[PDB]
């Protein structure tokens, strides 16, 4: 017998409603089975879209879910339908309540400056694989560089810093958004520490 989709939760890649969600399920032992992709409104459980991808975890466009809802997807409930390709029979639709998923706490960032002049921002990997980081220097209080880096450590070249400001920065602030291995993410958590030589 076909099994209803299990382990289903909206896997936010950022802010709830401003990021992609992933349909996750355990692949059944029965071959040739894929899960339909849709999401339910809170009030009436409306269907957002319909597509079939064999991948166990897959990103879903945020614009489509926002357009179907008409507002930010802060609270969602997810429905998924599993289809057997060989038989061609669409299975029972399974709607389950979904809660926002938050990634593990980011490693406490450490700001240090080397003798060369590079401002090295290092936070341990911990339980997060990649992070969304916005980098702002405290002297100018502007986010000069914004990038989502998988590397646990961020190093800014001394040449680039000298070109940007003319001298090395002593204090510099950063914000990190965690991402677990499965792709779950939490609201940005800010760590601030002065660079130490």
From Swiss-Prot:
It is found in: Virion. It comes from the Viruses. Transmembrane segments: none annotated. Assembles to form the non-contractile sheath that surrounds the tail tube. Allows viral attachment to the host by binding the bacterial outer membrane protein NfrA. Interacts with host NfrA receptor; this interaction is essential for viral adsorption to the host. It is uncommon for short-tailed phages to have a tail tube inside a non-contractile sheath. This is Non-contractile tail sheath. It comes from Enterobacteria phage N4 (Bacteriophage N4). The lineage of its organism: Viruses, Duplodnaviria, Heunggongvirae, Uroviricota, Caudoviricetes. The chain holds residues 1186 to 1382 of 1382 of the full protein.
